[PDB]
Every structure is written in structure tokens, then in C-alpha cells.
Amino acid sequence: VRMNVLADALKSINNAEKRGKRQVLIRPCSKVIVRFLTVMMKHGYIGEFEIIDDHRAGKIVVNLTGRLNKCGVISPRFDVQLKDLEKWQNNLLPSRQFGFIVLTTSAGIMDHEEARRKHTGGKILGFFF
Amino acid sequence: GKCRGLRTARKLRSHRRDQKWHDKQYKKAHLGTALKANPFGGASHAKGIVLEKVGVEAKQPNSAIRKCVRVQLIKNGKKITAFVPNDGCLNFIEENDEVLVAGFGRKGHAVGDIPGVRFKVVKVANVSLLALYKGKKERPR
């Protein structure tokens, strides 16, 4: 069956970006998916997106700007402390100059740099660069 | 595929532990049959008594007579064939003398042409074969 709707969403975005498409349809939507997409957008990686409201679960049309190399999910959602954040960055990110690891912390869903700024660990949702 | 779940630690560790037994080196070093069948009993060297001088025929591509000696180990009374490395070094050995024998370098494996020989003579009569070879020392009288 379908599990980790965030994994399916990120896989759809990645496959559409590999194909050069300007838009991708993500279904079903979720709060985690929307928060991940917003974190992606604030860094300029995907651009604007629209939530289609069907009366069971949302869909998202994400406009794609070809700035995205890889968006991926980390399953299972390993709990990450501030100490292990550097190791996760070394493992998952292509460089120390760009790329973000997205974590869910008690302060919300945010990239690893904002997690360090807020001095909090959390559970790793995925990465994008 | 493999199980990726936060509660799969026991399954992953058990699978790794069972699959390690399919590694030849791990199974060799963790069963005890290899240790019990090792003539040296896990040692690096062993002292033995030369029972006779033998000439082992090199493997098929090569043609030579490798001079070895049948030695019975003092530690367990086990009979092994030990290669006498250099040339004229079989002349330094006499029957029923004590030889210190090491491995042949391949950890229980035959080395080069010499088939089934995994040991080499290091000392004869408490004098190294290399000291006798170069004239540094002479056989005890």
C-alpha cells in the first residue's frame, strides 16, 4: 500500500525535475508535505505552488523552476540531535555551501541551519539541493 | 529489499549475525574446527623432530624437486611436511634432529609449486637455517 506520502511527493517532484517539466502534481497532500514545500520555496528551489481542495485529501500543483538537483526523503524519520547534524550534513549534502536537511522539531519543520540557529534537534524528514 | 524501520534493529542485527557465518574467513575463525585441525594449534611456530627427508615434485608447469622434511611436532605428535627453503640447506639437516618450523606465509595454504606443503623450516638444531646458510654459525657438535 501507500506509506510515507512525503516520500511519494518528493519522488514525484524529483522525477518531474529530471524530465524538465515546469509543473508537477502531488497527491495526496499533507501538512508535512506543505511544510516541506514551503521550506523548499523560501530557499528558492521550487517556487510557488497551489493546493487543490478535493473533499477527501488535497492535491498540490507545484510550479518547477529548474534549480532542483535532488529532493529526497529519509525513511525512517531518524531522531537527530545537534551533535549528529554535522554527520548527517556530510552524508547527505553535496557541499557545505548549499543544500539543506529538513527536520521536524518542536519549533516546526525547518532546514538544518535554522535548527542550529534555534538550538534544537528533531527527526530528519529529508533533504534537498 | 532490506527492512528500513525504526524497530527493525533486532531483525537487522540477527540477519547480519546469521549471514556472517556464510563468510569463509569468519566461519574459519569462529568455529573451532580449523583451530583444532591446525597442526600448530594456533601457534606461529612449532618445534618438531625430523623423521625423514623427502623430495616433493613441483606442480605440473614447473619441474624441480623441492627438498622438504617430515617432522613430528613435539606439542601434539602430529606429522607434517616442512619445506627446507634455500639450496644446500637440506644438507644442514640430519635425521632425528630438532627443527623449528613456521608457516609458509599463506595461512594454511600451499605456496607456489610445492603441493600440499604449508610449513617451512626456520631452525635446525637450535641454529637458524640462514645463519648456517651464510656461514655465520656451524652445526652444534
Add this chain to the structure above:
Amino acid sequence: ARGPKKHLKRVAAPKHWMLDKLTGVFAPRPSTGPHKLRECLPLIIFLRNRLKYALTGDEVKKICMQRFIKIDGKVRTDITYPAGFMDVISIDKTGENFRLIYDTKGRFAVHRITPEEAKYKLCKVRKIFVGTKGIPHLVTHDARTIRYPDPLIKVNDTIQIDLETGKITDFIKFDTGNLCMVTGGANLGRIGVITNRERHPGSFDVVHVKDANGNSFATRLSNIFVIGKGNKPWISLPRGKGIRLTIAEERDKRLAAKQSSG
């Protein structure tokens, strides 16, 4: 294994003695006494390693058998006598009095005191109990049993003891706003004002203490020792006033002092 042990390895000794590692295999095993094994300074360590009146333990024995050293007003000839927090060490021959006090690094500093302040000490009462036909007895951190204490005095309070008579002169209650020192844990040797005690029934109470420089820390209730009423200590403090410095601040102070001294 069988019966008590009588030795103490040099490396297994309390680290605040600042003993070496090459000066023998054994450390002075402190005798049984008022203070614990790991919270005391044996007389040999004080008279040899700190004061340097002796170069060997034999010289410490020679000094002590001349009855030159008094702990809390009583002459002690045991060179391994456990001397601990708040003890007064008096040497009348050289005419100097010290009080065994903690430094912010958690080590017994060589703290000289006046002859007038050597007449008393402070003791934290460890328990109070009615016994023997209704007499209230009070036990202190130095195992001093005092009968008929003031009914206001409770556990965790501090009492000023006149060393000559061993009787209570005054007392400080354990309360917020009272000056105190930390006698155990990471914050050992720090001096500050109690701000909040948060109780854990069935467990250890935790007391929060604010430095005189604004820094705040926490300890267990057993590690608090009330020093004075309010913020004025009833006893003299070391060169540092219980204010622990950071390594950066300590390095800067050391560099500035060496620049201005030589």
C-alpha cells in the same frame, strides 16, 4: 574482600589532593573521622603538599608528634587525620590559623584566618532527633553531637560552634536569599545566594544558587552549606570569593597579571 581495606592507591585517591603519579604507589589513606574519605584533606597532605613544612611523611610525623597542630582546638597527632570542610587548623608554634575551605576548582585552599576567627566554626546540621528522656540532639556534618539545641534549628541549617566549648553560638536558617557554598558536585567551591529550592518528594531536592556576579547554577540539597545570613558571609572567604571564572576569563586574568607583574 574480607573486612575493611586499609590502603589507598595513589591514582585512586581524591583528585582534589593534587597528588602526583610518580611519587609512590600509595596515597595517604585517611583515618576514620568526622569527614568522609573523599571529602577530606589528610593532615599529611596539608602539612607536606600544601604548607611544605615537611618534605617527607616522616617529617610530617615529627611535626605532629611535637603536638604543634590542632584541629578544631584539639591537638591531633594522627598524620592521616581526616580534616574537612570548615575545620580550623591552628599552629601556635608558628602562630597561624587556617580554615579548610573549598576553592572554586573544588580543592581545599590554603586559607589563612585570624586568631579571633579561629575560635569558632560553621557546621551544617545533618539531623535533629529527640532521644533519651526527651532531650533534643542535633548531629552536624562533622559528626558533632550537640544536646539541647534551639528548637528553631532544623536540618540543612548552619550553626556557629564555639570550638572551646562546642556549643551553639548562633544559627542561620536554610532559606532563600541566604549565602551558601557548594560542597559537592560540579559546582563545588562556588559561593552564592540561594534563590529557589524545588522539592522532589522521595528523591533529591535541587537548590538554585546565584553568584555574586549574576551567574546561576544548581546543586542537590545535600551539597548546599549555608554560609551567611543574606549575602554577608559569617566567615572569611578565599582569594576568590566563590565566583568561578570561565577558562577564557581566567586566561585573560592570568595574562594581564603576568603583564603587570613581570
Add this chain to the structure above:
Amino acid sequence: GRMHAPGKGLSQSALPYRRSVPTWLKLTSDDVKEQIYKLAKKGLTPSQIGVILRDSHGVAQVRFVTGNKILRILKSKGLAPDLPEDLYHLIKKAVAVRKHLERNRKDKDAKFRLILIESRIHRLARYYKTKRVLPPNWKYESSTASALV
């Protein structure tokens, strides 16, 4: 896909976006409740009741006119069956397969299908027992099944 078949069928009802009573439908909520009560008294299950309300009375979705689902309506009135409709139909199918198998004992396909049906029955019974719809002592047997049918 299907629980016990390799099929991956997609056919199903596609509900409209609106959750409102349709314009053509003049039936009030109490009228729909009364029609449901009459249909249940006639001996029809909620699936059948909804089918004939949709097909002859213009009631597209009873939940959007009454505010309640048909099974909940029947439970509130008190004329709902002891065991749920899907479990009852599964037990009926299993009973029919078992009755066929007694006179046709060489039908290995019937035995396979009976095993599948009984697995479905056990899964549904476990679900209903967790949800406390069935008593915790309720068990499916190969002899008392025809009594429940």
C-alpha cells in the same frame, strides 16, 4: 489491489465535491429517515436501502440530507442487525461454499476459495472485536455458522 486476488481494479463510486442536498430533492430529513425505517422493516440492509433510495427516490447521499449515515440511523432507531452486514454476507458465502463442498469433495478450488473467504471473515471479525462491535468472545465456527445465517 484486491486483498485475495491479483486484480488491481479501479472501479468505485466518485463522490461529487458538494456536500449539499440536491435541488431536485424535496424530501426532508425526517421523510428520508421514515423511508429508511420502512425499508429496514422490510428486511433490507443499509447497502440495499441506499441503493433503492438513490435509484427511485432521488436521494444521492443520505448523509447529505439527514446528516447521518444509514447504519447509524438504524442503530439510533434501534433496528440494526446484531452482526454487521459485510461480516454477515461473508459468513453466508462461507456457509454456501461449505455446503457445496460436502457434496463436491473433489473441488480443490472450492477449498482454496473457502480458505480465502474464512481469512476475510477472521480479519473482519478481528477488526469488529477491536472496535467492540462484536463481543470479545465472538468466534467463527464451522458448525454454528449456518445458525448465524
Add this chain to the structure above:
Amino acid sequence: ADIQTERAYQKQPTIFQNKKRVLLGETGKEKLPRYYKNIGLGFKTPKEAIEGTYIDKKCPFTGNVSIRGRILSGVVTKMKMQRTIVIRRDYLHYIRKYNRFEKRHKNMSVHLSPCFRDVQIGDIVTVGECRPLSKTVRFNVLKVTKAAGTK
């Protein structure tokens, strides 16, 4: 019921029950005071213990045990012993190499007072650590919380 179901007379040692009687003070029964105490840590004495007749020297409220140390929890899985129940404590053990967890459990035999009626399999019990009560019992049930499925 009748608490004298043993070969020795069952009584609370603290309570002196055969005090000198009075004919006018007799009203059908001699009346019996109940010994009970409040265990600490904010645990309330059940109304059963205060107003019961059972004799249980290992009861935290009417017996001779003290609650000191660990306060633990678990779900009741067996009730086949006399005044003792087997609870299951479940947890996750962290394996660092795989950065993962494994479900582990252990069973604790804990004393259950007669003051706790209507305790069921699957109920959660808060137990308190006491002195060794038997070979394997070191905890006493202090509180019972019903399972959500009870009806």
C-alpha cells in the same frame, strides 16, 4: 467475606480488637477499628482499604511495607496467583550500530492488595518498589487505571 481462611488467626497487628466491652455499648457487633496509612508520593488510600475487612500484611495501605525507590508502570497480563499479578513492562532498546530500536519487555510479579477490586487483564498498574516480599516480588501495586476497552 470470612477473612479467617487460614490455620492461623488473621488480624492487623497494630489493632487491639478484644478491648474490654460494655453492655450498653454493644449494638449487635463489637465494632472493629481499621489500621490504614497513606503511602507517600501523593497516592490516595482506596476507599476499600479504609473500610475493608481483608487482612494482607503486604498491602501498602494496611500492611507492613514501605514504598521507597522506583515507581514503575505496566499492563496486567496474568492474575492467576494469590494476591500477586504478572505485569508486562514494554520498552524500546536502542541499537547504535543500526541507529534503530528493538521491542523488548520483561514481566514483573507484583503484589496486588484486595483493596483493588475489578482489576482486569490489560489494565495499567502503577507499582511502587518495596522490600523483597517473596522470591520474585519486589513491587506493590499502588494504583490501577482501567483499560479503554473495559465495559
Add this chain to the structure above:
RNA sequence: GAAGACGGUCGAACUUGACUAUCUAGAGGAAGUAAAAGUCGUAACAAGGUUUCCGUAGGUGAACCUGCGGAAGGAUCAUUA
């Protein structure tokens, strides 16, 4: 108040029963492996000269042969209203 004695208890204790094993006065039987292209054949590799192989059963100096079912890793991706 010693020796000593009865009764308990703890209880070591120069051999029999479950001695799992090993090492052997010990030949036999079946293998395997390494030598040697010695001998009788040519089973396989080409349609290897009966296409090969699988499961199963029987038969044979030996490779192997044959019966039934299967596979193409076939020597046919195809054979015509």
C-alpha cells in the same frame, strides 16, 4: 568441667552404568581429493554426428541409455485461405 556415646545436620569420599567426544594393538566397505592426457571408450562442446538440460523411475563395463512430464539456457522470435 575433659575423654566418650546416642540422635541430627552440613557433608567431602581410591569406579560402573546415559559412557555426547577424542586418541587408537585394528584390518575391512564406501567415498572424496589430489597424480597421470597410462587403459577401455567418446558422454558433452558444431544439429558433437540420437539437440541439450531438468524432475522422476528403471536398466547398463563406464561415460550413459530408455520411458513419462517439463524447459530453451535451440538448431525455430517468422511459414502464409
Add this chain to the structure above:
RNA sequence: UAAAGUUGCUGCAGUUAAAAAGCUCGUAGUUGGAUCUCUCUCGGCCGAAGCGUUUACUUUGAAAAAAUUAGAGUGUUCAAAGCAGGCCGCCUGGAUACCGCAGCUAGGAAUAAUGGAAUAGGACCGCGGUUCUAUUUUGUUG
């Protein structure tokens, strides 16, 4: 031990190189779709006893033997070391970090699990049926 990503959690392979069980069902195990934004009292600008259902998670705090490791200072003649030393009696050090897991503690409340009215024994707002009132009896037993 590394090389060995030839034990692969990170991080391997399984059409033909070694390899997916003949095929389904099935319990444990593992995994599991969307959804929900801080109140009665006390010594008048405070202080709180808490049960807000908890757990995981995360952050903080406490407590946690030295030696070893990391690491600060210090010309052992350098260094490995050592915990010494430095100035013309005096001055100064003998730091600090880490210390996993479990336990303790205080914040956060995203994620994950769980729970709260449905059969109404449902939430709040004021009284009946069986009893004694922790001495409201203070010029005295009551």
C-alpha cells in the same frame, strides 16, 4: 585492524556471473492514507498546590573515581614524558571538555503512537432517601 561497498545501518547483491521459496493463505514481527490553531485560594502590580492523559523525541539542568584519550599552561637542554614551576622571602599552576544507554530534572509540543460524549452510566450550574459532624459549646465537667 584498514584495505573489504568481499557482511553493505550508513552501504552490497539475487534475468543470464552465487542467488526469489512451485504457489497462495496465515499468527507473531516489521510497516501503515488525509484530517483537529492553562482553573477554585493568599500576607494587593505577585506568589502558586496542580492533572493539562501520557509516551517517544529534542533541549536544559543535576549527579556521575582517577588513570587513559581530547585538551589549557609550563624550554625535561628538545622530545616521549612530568606536574611542575616563575621573580628579586614573594608570585602561580595542578584547568577544561567528553563520560554512551538506562534512571533523575525542567522547557518545547512539529513528527510518531495513545486517549478522552455514540448504549449517553456524558460536561458545567443549585437540593432529597441511609450516618456520625476533625470539640462552631471558652467565667465550669456538657
Add this chain to the structure above:
RNA sequence: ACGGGGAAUCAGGGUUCGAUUCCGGAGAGGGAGCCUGAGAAACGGCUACCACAUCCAAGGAAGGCAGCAGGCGCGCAAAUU
């Protein structure tokens, strides 16, 4: 297989080692039982049996280096009475 502190290796993760001077345990040839004492089931204490072994005038007596040195033995393998 005494446990741990810890050691070797190690990009990250890990793998292996830890008899060995510090902490905790266990034992004093193997078992067992005790006296004394605050503390021992102590062995540089006693009492037996089991194994080994010393002196004897053959009646008896006396043993316990896994303390420091030093022998023997074992071994590839480890120092001064």
C-alpha cells in the same frame, strides 16, 4: 569468556582486543566443614577426605610459591635464589 575503566585500528559508520599494575569479583592443589574475631567459611589459620608429596629408628611426624627470587615441566613464547 573474570567484568569494567580502557587498547589497536578507524573519513563517517564500524571491526577486533581488554590474563595484565585502577575499580569490582573469584581462588589459593580439588572439594567440604569450622575456630577465633568487628570483620574469614581465612588457607604464609585449623579439621577431614581426594590427588601429589617430605622425614622416619616404621612407633609416628609434617605439608600447600596463582607472594618475592629461584628450580622442574610445558612449550614459539617471558628476567636476579
